[PDB]
Structure formats: C-alpha cells, structure tokens
Structure 1
Amino acid sequence: SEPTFVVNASLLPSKVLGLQVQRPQSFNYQPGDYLFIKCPGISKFEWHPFTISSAPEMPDVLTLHIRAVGSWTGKLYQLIREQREEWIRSGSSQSLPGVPVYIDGPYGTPSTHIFESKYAILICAGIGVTPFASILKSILHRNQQNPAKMPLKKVHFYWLNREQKAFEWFVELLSKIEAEDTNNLFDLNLYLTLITGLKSRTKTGRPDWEEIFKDVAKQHAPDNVEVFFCGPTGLALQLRHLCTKYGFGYRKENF
C-alpha cells in the first residue's frame, strides 16, 4: 500500500479510462507488471488488478487503461467523467483535485520474458493489449540506448478488436513504431473481428492462426519461438494446440 493520486485521465473510445497515477519515489516495476488498486471513493474495501500500460522509463507517473465492463470500473468511469465535466463548467480557481487511490504491487507476469527471447508472437484482444503496450514502449527506450544489449530479434504483434475506434487507445504508439522501426524488429497486425490511417493495412475477420503459426515457424526454425497471449480462453485453447503442433513456447494463463 502507498496512498497516492489519479492526477489526470483521458476518456477514450469504448468507455476506456487513460488514468495517470503519481508514481511513489520507491515504486520500481518492469514492463508486463500489474498492480492492485483501491479507490475509497468507489469502495473502501475492493482491490482490482490492472496492467501498468506505461513503461518504467516514464519517470513520475504510471498509466492504467481501464475499460468500464461492470460494477467497479463503471463507477470509476462515472466518477472520473463527472469530476471532469464539473471542471469544464467551473474548473478555474485551483487545479484538477485528484482522486485518492491505494496501489499494491508490482506483480509479475511471464510476458516480461519477451526481453530474453530471440523470437516472440504477442497476441491480444481488446484491452488485453495493455501489457504489450508497456513492453513495446520499453523496447523503443531500450533500442535508442542499447541496441546490442538486447537479444530480441523479431516481434510478431497481433491485436484483435470488435470495434475500430478501440485502435485509437494506442494508434500513436503504433505510428511511432512504424516511424522508428527502420531495422524491422516489428511486424504489426491489427484485425477487426490504412484503416487505422497507419502504413499497416487493418485486416478483417478472425485471423488464420494455423497459417500465421506455419509462417512464423518457417521464418525462425530451428530456433525457439515464444508465444505470449493476453485475451479470451476460447482463443487460448486454439493457440495452445498450435503451440504444440509447431513447437512454440506457451504459458498456461487462461483457465
């Protein structure tokens, strides 16, 4: 527990909160880490886990991207909306109040092992992108400072969304990767289930995972490929079968 503050927030399509949280002097994390958060204004007692969508190289704030999907996220959305509307109407004398919260973390995920892999597939659906958002930014910081120091040779990125407007959560970051990725570390793939106004053609329908895995296996054999997944369990079963078929690294993270 650290008592800290939501100092700012963005209201992004598909009811998502781009929260900025004052980072305590002590709080070190790695990309892929999550924390538990308590907002006394919503519940004195409930803790909910959220991925840190920021990279730890950002120095005074952490970011969380939280989608309104039920009771507690709905209430935090409504609280942040209303506080922000009240400021449009008044919002003058002092600066933005700041919502008090408690944070517990960081907690680790096997996704952090990407930095020690040669070849990685990152697959995410909807807000499932957030740990991969942290990791992509961190790769950009680590490259402008130490391209030799890193053994990650290729990153295959697959991000699925039911709703086109959801790509806006991280379209800037994806733009910057298209800009700065002269050495083609990344292969970005956006599926609606260019169109992002990116140099990446937004694809449509369920990806052909069999065909993608076959291709990635031909590119990297006989070396090890690590699959990292953040999304629904029905997809996980399919990905797990394919990981066995082509000899890829899988972590069971879906039950």
Structure 2
Amino acid sequence: GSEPTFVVNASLLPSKVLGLQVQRPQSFNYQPGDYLFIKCPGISKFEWHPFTISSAPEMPDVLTLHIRAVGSWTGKLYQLIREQREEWIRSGSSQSLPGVPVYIDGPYGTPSTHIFESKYAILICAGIGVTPFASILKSILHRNQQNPAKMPLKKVHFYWLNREQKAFEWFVELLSKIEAEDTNNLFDLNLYLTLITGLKSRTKTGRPDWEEIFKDVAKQHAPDNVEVFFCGPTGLALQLRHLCTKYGFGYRKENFPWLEL
C-alpha cells in the first residue's frame, strides 16, 4: 500500500520550489523518469499527490522531489517546511526541526524511460516539467561513466523553457557538470527564457522556432529514428505532435495538466 519514511533534508529554491530529500526504503527500486505519490499527514491525513523523482536511482540513500507551491497542498507543505526552518534559525533547537513523516507509493513508470533504448532523442520541457529529465540526465552520466559500451543513445537534444530566469537555478549545477564532462558531445543543451545562466550555453530568448529545430535535427539523423519526449503545456504538445508527423519522429500522446498556461 505504501512505505513509511521521512524528510531528511529540504531546500527553498526560486520560483516557489521546495526541494525535498526523502529517505529511500530498502525495497524502493526505480527507474529514471518514474514518479511516486506522497502523503504528508501533517498537511493532510488522506490526500496523496504525485511528483516525479528528480534524483537518479544510482544515488543510494535518498529520493529527491522538486515540488512547486502552486496551490493548497503544495503551498501548505512549503509553509510547513519554511516555518520549521525559520524557527530553527532563531531557536537553534533540535525541537524547532522535528523531522517530517511521509508515506510514499511508487514507483510508477512513464514512457520517457525508453530514452535509454533510443539512438537519438529530443527532450522538451517547460518549468517544473524538467524533473523527469533531471533524473534521466543524471542517470545517463552515471551509466556512461560505469559502462559506456552498454548504452545505445548517441545524441540528446535538450530544451528547457522558463518564464522566469531564476527557475534555471533548480538544475544549474547539473547542467554545468554536463557541460564540463561531455567531452564526446553527447548533449546539445538549449535554455529558453520565454552566458546568461553563467553556463557555457547561452540562454536564448522568446519561444523556440520548433519548425526550424525539428528540420535541423531531422537532417542530422536521417534516415534513422528520432524519439521526442515532452513534459509541458498542451498548446506546445499540439505543435510538437504535428512536427513529429511531418518529420517522422516518435511521439507519445501525453498530457500534463499541472503545466498548462
């Protein structure tokens, strides 16, 4: 039904995000891109909410979630965590920071995990939609270091769109590490504010020209299959779906209601 466990650490990140570390049960095996449902009895005894696991399964003791405060339950959890921590800076007491019991239900799979069996992949995300791809990019790094022979993936085109510049900070370190360690040019990283991030990669501005992007990527990889993976709003999905048909790219019909405009 679920595993009892605890928040072991947290962070308060820009654009209203709660970075959460949760102790990983001995039984909990997952794949990059998976999500779980979480219950926090302190916020609500009975509600379960889904979040993508932003950590990689290669990381041994903790699971990570990046939860954006957009409403009632997420807003309360953010507030609970902040207030416990604000009381700690004053009191300095262990009593001001009790530890947060939670229950987790998972893992639950998604088709994005099939990136590991693809040759060429496009990854497109908006806002907090980045989280499955954060997990996936980390796991790719672990896998290439541990056993490069065993991975068929030859090129990853990554696109991350944000309304607010400060949101890129959620994963700026992971993206720096990729830039530093990608000697063989596995990754093509693209950041769009809809270097500028302090990365080698220049933050671009406006809505990407998806027709031009897809055209270029099709030329790079023809006549092979390219797989498109997406986590964003529906108006964008419609555009991408049309373009996948036009260029013969793999598409999964999925919707992400928490990312709508």
Shorter-chain-normalised TM-score: which range? over 0.9
Would the aligned equivalents of 2:9 and 2:21 in 1 still touch at CA under 8 Å? yes
Aligned to 2:5: 4
Give ranges in structure 2 of 5+ residues lacking alignment: 257-261
Question: SS where residue 139 of structure 2 aligns?
Answer: helix
Aligned to 2:82: 81
> Does the alignment pair 1:166 with 2:180?
no
- CA RMSD of the aligned region, Å? 1.0
Would the aligned equivalents of 1:38 and 1:48 in 2 still touch at CA under 8 Å? yes
Would the aligned equivalents of 1:37 and 1:102 in 2 still touch at CA under 8 Å? yes
Would the aligned equivalents of 1:39 and 1:101 in 2 still touch at CA under 8 Å? yes
Residues in 2 aligned to 1:223 and 1:249: alpha-carbon distance in whole angstroms:
11
Residues in 2 aligned to 1:73 and 1:145: alpha-carbon distance in whole angstroms:
37
Q: Percent identity between the aligned chains? A: 100
Would the aligned equivalents of 2:68 and 2:74 in 1 still touch at CA under 8 Å? yes
Residues in 2 aligned to 1:208 and 1:91: alpha-carbon distance in whole angstroms:
51
Deviations 1:214-247 (A, max 9, x none): 0000000000000000011110010000000000
Shift in Å, 1:8: 0.8
Residues in 2 aligned to 1:104 and 1:95: alpha-carbon distance in whole angstroms:
28
Residues in 1 aligned to 2:152 and 2:240: alpha-carbon distance in whole angstroms:
24
Shift in Å, 1:71: 0.6
Change (3 A) 1:23 1:95: farther
Shift in Å, 1:74: 0.5
Would the aligned equivalents of 1:7 and 1:96 in 2 still touch at CA under 8 Å? no
Shift in Å, 1:95: 8.8
Question: SS where residue 148 of structure 1 aligns?
Answer: helix
Change (3 A) 1:9 1:93: closer
Q: Which moved more, 1:39-48 or 1:90-99?
A: 90-99
Would the aligned equivalents of 2:87 and 2:96 in 1 still touch at CA under 8 Å? no
Would the aligned equivalents of 1:32 and 1:131 in 2 still touch at CA under 8 Å? yes
Would the aligned equivalents of 1:31 and 1:135 in 2 still touch at CA under 8 Å? yes
Residues in 2 aligned to 1:93 and 1:184: alpha-carbon distance in whole angstroms:
47
Residues in 2 aligned to 1:95 and 1:157: alpha-carbon distance in whole angstroms:
41
Question: SS where residue 24 of structure 1 aligns?
Answer: coil
Question: SS where residue 132 of structure 1 aligns?
Answer: helix
Residues in 2 aligned to 1:96 and 1:248: alpha-carbon distance in whole angstroms:
50
Change (3 A) 1:82 1:95: closer
Residue pairs, 1:216-227, within 5 angstroms: 216-227=217-228
Residues in 2 aligned to 1:145 and 1:186: alpha-carbon distance in whole angstroms:
18
Shift in Å, 1:98: 1.2
Shift in Å, 1:92: 3.4
Deviations 1:127-162 (A, max 9, x none): 000000000000000011111100000000000000
Would the aligned equivalents of 2:85 and 2:96 in 1 still touch at CA under 8 Å? no
Aligned to 1:58: 59
Shift in Å, 1:93: 4.5
Would the aligned equivalents of 1:117 and 1:226 in 2 still touch at CA under 8 Å? yes
Deviations 1:42-68 (A, max 9, x none): 110110000000000111100000000
Shift in Å, 1:254: 1.6
Would the aligned equivalents of 1:126 and 1:166 in 2 still touch at CA under 8 Å? yes
Residues in 1 aligned to 2:231 and 2:181: alpha-carbon distance in whole angstroms:
25
Deviations 1:12-50 (A, max 9, x none): 000100100000011000000000000001110110000
